[PDB]
Amino acid sequence: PNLSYIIGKDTWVEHWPEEDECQDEENQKQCQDLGAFTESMVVFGCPN
Structure with missing residues (x-):
């Protein structure tokens, strides 16, 4: 259970501004x- 994720080129990290910052x-x-997107990709899935 000691899994630690690795940051790579394939992984794109974007900061999400908070409600005050939004x-x-x-x-x-x-x-x-x-x-x-948080609702669309979760409910409707993805076209592929």
Whole structure:
């Protein structure tokens, strides 16, 4: 159970701004897209 994940080129890491930080105009679009995706990719799966 000592598994530790490895960061690589295939792995893309993006910071998710918090609810307070989501009020920013630049971050608002990213927050909305992440929130929509969190439900879409979880319920509808993926086309492939």
